[PDB]
Structure 1
Amino acid sequence: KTAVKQLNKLVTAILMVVTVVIWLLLLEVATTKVLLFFSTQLVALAFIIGSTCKNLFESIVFVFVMHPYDVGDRCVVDGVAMLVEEMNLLTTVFLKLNNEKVYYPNAVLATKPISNYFRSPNMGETVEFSISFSTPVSKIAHLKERIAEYLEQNPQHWAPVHSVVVKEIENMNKLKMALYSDHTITFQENRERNLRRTELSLAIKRMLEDLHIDYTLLPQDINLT
């Protein structure tokens, strides 16, 4: 609404200038040299002011045509999570997760990709863990079964669909694991996201501890002298 009011004021100013100048042209009181002088003054003016009108017009197009976000939603720019409160023609104002207030230019944002959390569907989160190369396959199967059971027992926070994937083996000693699961929310609900992720991490820890799964460094042999 603030952007709409500012645009209305700007276009009213443009209307005023154009109507007055064409009224003066209808009057036709200026001399021939005077009219040409005003025309060349307009030419010189155009360069300087249109140079900034480039940024101004592309910012209008970005705000109204693209319309990537609205006031109150959470967005990501260059990997940082922020919130939005204000919408001005030349600038937008955001809050970082620490409530730090920032003032962006709108032309710069037009060149950059932007993610919107409020407009996104339910999401997925990944928790990382590693286990030793000596782990038997049966233990891995039991871990998968327990993870599926736990995710089934908590339909409030997690979707039934999930996946446990294996990643490359390091020195044939370390297995790198990752669990993929989907919230019932987006990242707009930041505190709930973090709390639920913490609970899931604690559950995975309890699992890997009560299933007798251990990780160890590589053995070292030594020659004494």
Structure 2
Amino acid sequence: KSVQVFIWLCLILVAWILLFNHDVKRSPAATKVLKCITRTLISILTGAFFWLVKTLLLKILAANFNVNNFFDRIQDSVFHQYVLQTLAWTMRVLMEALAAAYHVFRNVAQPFFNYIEEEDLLRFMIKEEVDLVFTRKAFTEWVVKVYTSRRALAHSLNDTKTAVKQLNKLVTAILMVVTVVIWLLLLEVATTEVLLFFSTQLVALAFIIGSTCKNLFESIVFVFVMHPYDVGDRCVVDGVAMLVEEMNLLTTVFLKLNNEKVYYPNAVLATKPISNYFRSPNMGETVEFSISFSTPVSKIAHLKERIAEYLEQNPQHWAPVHSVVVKEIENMNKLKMALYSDHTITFQENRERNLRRTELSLAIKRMLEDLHIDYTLLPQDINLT
């Protein structure tokens, strides 16, 4: 549409120029109005070119956001469509897009059949498709997680669209003011002195509002170019974790672990480190405990073997890889000990991570209790009088 209107306007301008290109001076009054009209056509042509470049910038930004998120958005949409069947166009579909779902899934599954019914999937989709898509409780949990992910993707898309719309409004206002001033200058109504007075007032005001649109530009380049995080991702700033809520050009709203709303200046974040749990791979875990310096090495080996067995017998929560490291020796009476292991998920699920850490700590406590590992304070010698 933009190129069509641009060609329309340019053809109109050239046609007008050709008609009056001939040197036919109807009257001195006609010349002034003709010059004013031509200046108006040139000014509106410049405005149309500005609009074209503006929409080009907006479209390239939208395409960058698409390459960033629309792939996962379309994947989630396809997964949801496949699940529903078992039980651009992609951008439009994404924009358009618990107990009840679990009940529906259970009803679809054959009675007294915990595993997914192959016949039901086959009748609704091909066997290969069903296998690729693939415990009633596990299926319900997966459906709930997929729905939550789709909702988060929709919220992220809406936030990005709102930010792009606000940026479009701002740049359109800038274009409007630029084109009106361009038309005024072309019309040549103001004399010299007033023009330089306007110029000096303009450089003054330019410094004034530059002191702020510098921060604005930093914020937009931060949110767009670096793109450290998306909506709904858990991030840590200054050592405190929080969840992204709203993406604005000048600010970003975050929710702390205590459901406390926080407002941040986007410009400041550009000068601070940002960590993302959602984008990070499976995260590690650390536990701390201490034992006596007199503990035999055999007990330490037994504890290591028990830890390895416990970790390998629970793959769903902890990966087989693990390590036990001695930190430091305190007066050769206390031996600092720590265990390192990796979850099967990231820190995004804070509640699940905390529960798993508590379970691991309880397991370590029990295992230490059975092994009879004891810690004793340094003996004190007392001389009576």
Q: Provide the TM-score with structure 1 as the length reference.
A: 0.99
Matched residues, number = 225
- CA offset digits 1:168-208 (Å, max 9, x no partner): 11011000000000000000010000000000000000000
1:26 Cα deviation after fit: 1.1
- CA offset digits 1:131-181 (Å, max 9, x no partner): 000000000000000000000100000100000000111011000000000
SS for the counterpart of 1:64 is helix
Partner of 2:379: 219
1:40 Cα deviation after fit: 1.0
1:108 Cα deviation after fit: 0.6
Structure 1's consecutive aligned runs of 4 or more residues displaced over 4 angstroms after TM superposition are none
1:221 Cα deviation after fit: 1.0
Alignment RMSD (CA, Å): 0.6
User: 1 CA distance for matches of 2:346 and 2:214?
Assistant: 36
User: 2 CA distance for matches of 1:216 and 1:106?
Assistant: 53
1:12 Cα deviation after fit: 0.4
SS for the counterpart of 2:381 is strand
- CA offset digits 1:33-58 (Å, max 9, x no partner): 11111111101111111011111111
SS for the counterpart of 1:219 is coil
- Unaligned runs of 5+ residues in structure 1 are none
What is the aligned counterpart of 1:90 among 250, 265, 289?
Answer: 250
User: 2 CA distance for matches of 1:103 and 1:118?
Assistant: 21
Q: Provide the TM-score with structure 2 as the length reference.
A: 0.58
Structure in which a larger fraction of residues adopt strand: 1
2:363 pairs with 1:203 = yes
**Structure having the higher Rg:** 2
User: 2 CA distance for matches of 1:8 and 1:29?
Assistant: 31
User: 1 CA distance for matches of 2:204 and 2:382?
Assistant: 83
Instruction: Quote the sequence identity (%).
Output: 100
1:2 Cα deviation after fit: 1.7
- CA offset digits 1:94-147 (Å, max 9, x no partner): 000000001000111000001000000001000100000000000000000000
RCO higher in 1 or 2 (8 Å CA, sep ≥ 6)? 1
SS for the counterpart of 1:187 is coil
- CA offset digits 1:4-60 (Å, max 9, x no partner): 111000000011011111111110101111111111110111111101111111111
User: 2 CA distance for matches of 1:118 and 1:168?
Assistant: 34
User: 2 CA distance for matches of 1:85 and 1:94?
Assistant: 5
- CA offset digits 1:49-75 (Å, max 9, x no partner): 101111111111111111101110000
User: 1 CA distance for matches of 2:233 and 2:367?
Assistant: 36
SS for the counterpart of 2:321 is strand
User: 1 CA distance for matches of 2:194 and 2:318?
Assistant: 75
